[PDB]
A paper describes a structure:
KIF14 is a microtubule-based motor protein with essential roles during cell division. KIF14 belongs to the kinesin-3 family of motor proteins. As all kinesins, KIF14 possesses a highly conserved catalytic motor or head domain that contains nucleotide and microtubule binding sites, and where ATP hydrolysis is coupled to the generation of mechanical work. Here we report the near-atomic resolution structures of twenty KIF14-microtubule complexes corresponding to five distinct KIF14 constructs in four nucleotide conditions mimicking four key steps of the ATP hydrolysis cycle.
Construct K755 includes the neck-linker and part of the first coiled coil heptad repeat of the CC1 domain. The structure of the core motor domain of the MT- K755 and MT-K772 complexes in the Apo and ADP states conform to the open configuration, as it is also the case for the complexes with the shorter KIF14 constructs. However, different from the MT-K743-ADP/Apo and MT-K748-ADP/Apo maps, the MT-K755-ADP/Apo and the MT-K772-ADP/Apo maps show a neck-linker associated density going sideways reaching the motor domain of an adjacent protofilament. Because such density is not observed, the map is better fitted with a model in which the KIF14 dimer in the Apo and ADP states binds to the microtubule in a one-head-bound state. In this state, one head is bound to the microtubule with the nucleotide-binding pocket in the open configuration and the other is tethered and presumably in a semi-closed configuration similar to the microtubule-unbound KIF14-ADP crystal structure (K-ADP_4OZQ). The tethered motor domain remains mobile (disordered) and the dimer adopts a one-head-bound conformation similar to the MT-K755-Apo/ADP and MT-K772-Apo/ADP structures. The conformation of the neck-linker in the K772 and K755 Apo/ADP structures suggests that the tethered head is positioned sideways and toward the microtubule plus end (the direction of movement) relative to the trailing position seen in the two-head microtubule-bound intermediate (step 2).
Author numbering:
A (entry chain K): 391 to 750
B (entry chain B): 1 to 428
C (entry chain A): 1 to 441
């Protein structure tokens, strides 16, 4: 069923920032969220289903990473065992610390390693001679509407890209043609692979910051569930398959300010197109929720199209967005909320239905 | 200072170009030698949109031809206007595909496409600033579909900032001049909804019914059916070649008319079409054209529009006119017939006007429209398609060039999915 | 001395300018060929004033105006037209592609490497005069060349030149009529960017002049010339103060003060009272009471905005010709005596008056008639909130389905930008309904 469940987070100040005394602006009154332009002209108000807080380490309802995992991840790990595909997104501009929320650090681990570790744990709980579990992995990206590979190395001649395709099987949905799939049992192994993937990622320094991204990044984990053992002879009449797709996304990248023509501009354009189409897709899902019949523009983009079976249908999803509270960065921050306004899924709607008179 | 290139594939594209250059040459004052015998300077200020120049005031076009069989080449050259074209641009090969899309996307076109692009690059680089590309290719058949689609793909990998546009004939319900129209057509749409900014559907049946009813012609011919397509093509760029109180271009018609990008299949129309006696019994005013244009029968799709609503339409009038009357008539059209229009667009019409009219009339007009009623066309093809593919009728001639069943199934979805999009807006 | 740079943009601005100069030249006694038979015969007089017309030692006059586009079909019509040997042949074209009626190409992809030529010529024109520099920029909503380029130019001229008077005789979108299907977007964004930099921004519309021309002058088949001559006579009715001599004159710095109470509310309307042909020029007295009553009629307005559902925050009247000011004061009193009109409580003065001695003139081949007086009205009112409340409702629909966007993001824009302007416009609506509340003590 339709399970969008968008979330938003608020980081703390840095040490550098607390030295410079970044003027706090973003405030709360619990579930509702407010912001106050330092001109003190108007107050914008945003509601979401869920609201975390990581600015004051002492305040009630504090959002530590344990809370993040224990509230968002666990339904995914649970549903995957039921045999359903799931997906998790991530929005956020550079400086809002998506790296802190997803990956985290050794003393405050983020989401990824917790999810993988709990998967390992439940595997080692259910692992009997009656049942087996196989886990396979893969990693790719999106850049100027093309597709590449990251896990796989390349030729030491020049910019030896990895040109790939997207094709459609009539049953299992779309896939990639030429892709590397690998096997896993150790968390350290996936950490190694993930580092090897994130190194080759498509990036470029700018006047803003050296470490910025220009390419979306998919991390795919295929799960397998083999139980079918015929009582009158060993025979796999079927085996359940279930997918997990994490993805990292780039920013909104207003280009009227960062006026640096060439490729830096021709990549941000495609990036924003992908964001737009993803937003349309989620806004369509929220209406699919309500029993109404509608169209979905799956085929209009690429990253939507390699997700078609994991996003739609009986599939549980999510999304989160890191931000920055420092009033110096309000503009980018506002878009970082204005993209995720799906809280009003079905409010203030007219109704006209007459299908009564069911009688003799 | 801007530019348009013309590519011409298959039999249809070549026989159409042989009447399009015949109409443009008659408007800019050109003669079969490629010389000038016009009357007004105003025809030469923007001749550099379609034509190049030459040594002795001769003018030569940016026309390119493709065909994989010379059976048309000598038909053009041995004609009235087959000799100004640049002989280095008459590309060809041999051993035509024989209405097999596979032979014109994989095998032969793979040999000829670089020889085509070697000329396309020459004709591009010799321009100052570029706007977009034009093309004239049939579907259903072979060469024009396969090689044309391939050219589109290679270009929009090469030159994506700029525009692309096609004037593509389509198959028809009643009669088919080829037994494998649906298959080739579906495979063509799989590679033309992605890599296009606008394409204009034309259907032979509509031209026939038009020429039977209105002009009351007795002995038509393909060469005179093409006279309406050349007219339309001419009108679409009249905003570009000439002045205008409210100018336009190709890109303007693209932005205004294509709300979401995949729905870029048009339904054209021209006015005032009348018989050789019945022009005395009519008046030349804006409403006399406006009632003729939104009629069901002056369209070229063989698609009853009144089975559906119009997402957006356009219009290009030509002559000394009164814009108040134009805008008022369009207001009344959006008023009386709201059911044939969409509510979530407030003004489903725009305009565009030029003040330099054609050689023989005081007034003229073209009409363009993105209607939902194209839906019933594609419902045919898929239907026509799938029952044949349920039994694999003519498959092996297509698998015999390194293909797979997979490549068909994809295409089918990409049409059916598209159809569903239109139906989303067919209801209120 | 007093001077005014004029900067036309887009097919609206240039087709307007070719009329404004046709009129200005016929007033000051000039032939289109630059020279001056008039003062050649008088042997004196400043009448070819240095306000608009720079002057060389060789007797030839060159106007202080420039105009731009990115589609040279227009400027070539000038260069070949009747007026080719008048203007400076720095008529800045970069007509390599149009704006596609999007704000994005006009303000960013083809707004870079091109704007600097315009700024250079503007400096070249300013450094020629040690005097007033009140800008007049004639553009039009909807289009890209007239929305985005203007939005880029004003925000830069506010940086270079700062505290000078900047104005805009912009054109408005008709609510029913349109020649486009993207005017709402391309209008709301422009309002957001130009709410701050500009000082006043007059507004006219295309539907009201159509309806006028069918009503009064008995015209059946208008064009896109006849309307522009009315815009040009409006502009003359303003600039007569700066050029010519008479009783009560109004410089450009006065309009921005008297009519812009708050910084954000600077979007007035406009009107010309006498509009008549050679037949109806007779059979009528043409007093001042008749005129100043006609100026407030609903039909003689120039935007389709009923004022009776609104209130006049401020108003300025500029007359011409043989005038007797006690008639003007009697007219103002007769106006405030009425009850259909409603002024606010915080402006019992409201009115302003400016008089000039010159008559109007005629553009031969035109519908208007030789008279002995004429009048112009400008108003900052509150009915026009409706003409914004519709536009956002023409916006909120489309954006609900993220439509007509993919081009825009395709030329360097963030979608969330839309979601800012809708707010900064909505706040504006609240202001036009905040002030309408009368104070309480
Ligand atoms: C002497 C005269 O004026 O007769 C007309 C004429 O009778 C009519 C029927 C012309 C005639 O058109 C046809 O014969 C015709 C018949 C069937 C299908 C298509 C065309 C005409 O042949 C066509 C021709 O139209 C033009 O000249 C336009 O420029 C047309 N170009 C050409 O016809 C042309 C083609 C090749 C070489 C030279 C000229 C055109 C239309 C749109 C944009 C650009 C050009 C004209 C005026 C007429 C004749 C000659 C009878 C009409 O032409 C068009 C397409 O608008 C058919 O309806 C109009 C109305 C005219 O009244
Ligand atoms: N009053 C008047 N308006 C005009 C005239 N010509 C065009 N317009 C207006 O121009 C608007 C169309 O957009 P424009 O402002 O012209 O944009 P543009 O000049 O084409 O510039 P681009 O959009 O970049 O192509 C419409 O609202 C018309 O009313 C004219 O001659 N007189
Ligand atoms: N309108 C029009 N259509 C044509 C003409 N000649 C061919 N066609 C269309 O072109 C199709 C034939 O495809 P074709 O171009 O011959 O394939 P090719 O042999 O590979 O080039 C048919 O469906 C016809 O409808 C013509 O003169 N006029
Ligand atoms: Mg323009």
């Amino acid at each position: 069923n339709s399970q969008v469940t968008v979330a938003v987070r608020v980081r703390p100040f840095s040490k550098r920032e607390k030295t410079e005394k970044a003027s706090q602006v973003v405030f709360t009154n619990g579930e509702e969220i407010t912001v106050e332009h330092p001109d003190m002209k108007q107050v914008y108000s945003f509601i979401y289903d869920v609201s975390f807080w990581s600015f004051d380490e002492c305040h009630p309802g504090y959002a530590s990473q344990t809370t993040v995992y224990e509230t968002l991840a666990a339904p995914l790990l649970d549903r995957a065992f039921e045999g359903y595909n799931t997906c998790l997104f991530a929005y956020g501009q550079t400086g809002s610390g998506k790296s802190y929320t997803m990956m985290g650090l050794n003393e405050e681990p983020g989401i990824i390693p917790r999810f993988c570790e709990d998967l390992f744990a439940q595997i080692a709980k259910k692992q009997t001679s009656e049942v087996s579990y196989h886990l396979e992995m893969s990693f790719f990206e999106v850049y100027n509407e093309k597709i590449h590979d990251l896990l796989v190395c390349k030729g030491e001649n020049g910019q030896r890209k990895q040109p790939l395709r997207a094709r459609e099987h009539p049953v299992s949905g779309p896939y990639v043609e030429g892709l590397s799939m690998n096997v896993v049992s150790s968390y350290s192994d996936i950490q190694s692979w993930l580092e090897l993937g994130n190194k080759q990622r498509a990036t470029a320094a700018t006047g803003m910051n050296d470490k910025s991204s220009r390419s979306h990044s998919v991390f795919t984990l295929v799960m397998t569930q083999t139980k079918t053992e015929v009582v009158e002879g060993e025979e796999h009449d079927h085996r359940i398959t279930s997918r997990i797709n994490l993805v990292d996304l780039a920013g909104s990248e207003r280009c009227s300010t960062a006026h640096s023509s060439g490729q830096r501009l021709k990549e941000g354009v495609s990036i924003n197109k992908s964001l737009l189409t993803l937003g349309k897709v989620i806004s369509a899902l929220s209406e699919q929720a309500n029993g109404k019949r509608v169209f979905i523009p799956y085929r209009e983009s690429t990253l939507t199209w390699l997700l078609k079976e994991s996003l739609g249908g009986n599939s549980k999803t999510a999304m989160i967005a890191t931000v920055s509270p420092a009033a110096s960065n309000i503009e980018e921050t506002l878009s970082t909320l204005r993209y995720a306004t799906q809280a009003r899924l079905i409010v203030n709607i007219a109704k006209v239905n007459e299908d009564m008179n069911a009688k003799l | 200072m801007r530019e348009i290139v013309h590519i011409q594939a298959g039999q249809c594209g070549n026989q159409i170009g042989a009447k399009f250059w015949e109409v443009i040459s008659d408007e800019h004052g050109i003669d079969p030698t490629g010389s000038y015998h016009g009357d007004s300077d105003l025809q030469l200020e923007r001749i550099n949109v379609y034509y190049n120049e030459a040594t002795g005031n001769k003018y030569v076009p940016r026309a390119i031809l493709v065909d994989l069989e010379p059976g048309t080449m000598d038909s053009v050259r041995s004609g009235p206007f087959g000799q100004i074209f640049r002989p280095d641009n008459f590309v060809f090969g041999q051993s035509g595909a024989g209405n097999n899309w596979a032979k014109g996307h994989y095998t032969e076109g793979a040999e000829l496409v670089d020889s085509v692009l070697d000329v396309v690059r020459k004709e591009s680089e010799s321009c100052d600033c570029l706007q977009g590309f034009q093309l004239t290719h049939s579907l259903g058949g072979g060469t024009g579909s396969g090689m044309g689609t391939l050219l589109i793909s290679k270009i929009r990998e090469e030159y994506p900032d700029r525009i692309m546009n096609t004037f593509s004939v389509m198959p028809s319900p009643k009669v088919s001049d080829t037994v494998v129209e649906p298959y080739n057509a579906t495979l063509s749409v799989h590679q033309l909804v992605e890599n296009t900014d606008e394409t204009y559907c034309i259907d032979n049946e509509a031209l026939y019914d038009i020429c039977f009813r209105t002009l009351k012609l007795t002995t038509p011919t393909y060469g005179d059916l093409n006279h309406l397509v050349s007219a339309t093509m001419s009108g679409v760029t009249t905003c570009l070649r000439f002045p205008g109180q409210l100018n336009a271009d190709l890109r303007k018609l693209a932005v205004n008319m294509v709300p979401f990008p995949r729905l870029h299949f048009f339904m054209p129309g021209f006015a005032p079409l009348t018989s050789r006696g019945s022009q005395q019994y009519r008046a030349l005013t804006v409403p006399e054209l406006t009632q003729q244009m939104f009629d069901s029968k002056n369209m070229m799709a063989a698609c009853d529009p009144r089975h559906g609503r119009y997402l957006t339409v356009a219009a290009i009038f030509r002559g000394r006119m009164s814009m108040k009357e134009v805008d008022e008539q369009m207001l009344n059209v959006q008023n009386k017939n709201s059911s044939y229009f969409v509510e979530w667009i407030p003004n489903n019409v725009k305009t565009a006007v030029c003040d330099i009219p054609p050689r023989g009339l005081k007034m003229s007009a073209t009409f363009i429209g993105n209607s939902t009623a194209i839906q019933e066309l594609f419902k045919r093809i898929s239907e026509q398609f799938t029952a044949m593919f349920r039994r694999k009728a003519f498959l092996h001639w297509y698998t015999g060039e390194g293909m797979d069943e997979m490549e068909f199934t994809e295409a089918e979805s990409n049409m059916n999915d598209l159809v569903s999009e239109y139906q989303q807006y067919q209801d209120a | 001395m007093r001077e005014c740079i004029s900067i036309h943009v887009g097919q609206a601005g240039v087709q307007i300018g070719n009329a404004c100069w046709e009129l200005y030249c016929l007033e000051h006694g000039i032939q289109p060929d630059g020279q001056m038979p008039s003062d050649k015969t008088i042997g004196g007089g400043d009448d070819s004033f240095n306000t608009f017309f720079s002057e060389t030692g060789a007797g030839k006059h060159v106007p202080r105006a420039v105009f731009v586009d990115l589609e040279p079909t227009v400027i070539d019509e000038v260069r070949t037209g009747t007026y080719r040997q008048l203007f400076h042949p720095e008529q800045l074209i970069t007509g390599k592609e149009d704006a596609a009626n999007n704000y994005a190409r006009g303000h960013y992809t083809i707004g870079k490497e091109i704007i600097d030529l315009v700024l250079d010529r503007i400096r070249k024109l300013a450094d020629q005069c040690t005097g007033l520099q009140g800008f007049l920029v004639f553009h039009s909503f909807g289009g890209g060349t007239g929305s985005g380029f203007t939005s880029l130019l004003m925000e830069r001229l506010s940086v270079d030149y700062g505290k000078k008077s900047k104005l805009e005789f912009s054109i408005y979108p008709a609510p029913q009529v349109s020649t486009a299907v993207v005017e709402p977007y391309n209008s709301i964004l422009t309002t957001h960017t130009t709410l701050e930099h500009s000082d006043c921004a007059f507004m006219v519309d295309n539907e009201a002049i159509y309806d006028i021309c069918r009503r009064n002058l008995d015209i059946e088949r208008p064009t896109y010339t006849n309307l522009n001559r009315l815009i040009s006579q409006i502009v003359s009715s303003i600039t007569a103060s700066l050029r010519f001599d008479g009783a009560l004159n109004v410089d450009l710095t006065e309009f921005q003060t008297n009519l812009v109470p708050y910084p954000r509310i600077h979007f007035p309307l406009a009107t010309y009272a006498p509009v008549i042909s050679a037949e109806k020029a007779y059979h009528e007295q043409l007093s001042v009471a008749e005129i100043t009553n006609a100026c407030f009629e609903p039909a003689n307005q120039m935007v389709k905005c009923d004022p009776r559902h609104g209130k006049y925050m401020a108003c300025c009247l500029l007359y011409r010709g043989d005038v007797v000011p006690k008639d003007v004061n009697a007219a103002i009193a007769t106006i405030k005596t009425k009850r259909s009109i409603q002024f606010v409580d915080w402006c019992p003065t409201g009115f302003k008056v400016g008089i000039n001695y010159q008559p109007p003139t005629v553009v031969p081949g035109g519908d208007l008639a030789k008279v002995q007086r004429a009048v112009c009205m400008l108003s900052n009112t509150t009915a026009i909130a409706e003409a914004w409340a519709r536009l956002d409702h023409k916006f909120d629909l489309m954006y609900a389905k993220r439509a007509f966007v993919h081009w825009y993001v395709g030329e360097g824009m963030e979608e969330g930008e839309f979601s800012e302007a809708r707010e900064d416009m909505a706040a504006l609506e609240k202001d036009y309904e905040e002030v309408g509340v009368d104070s309480v003590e």
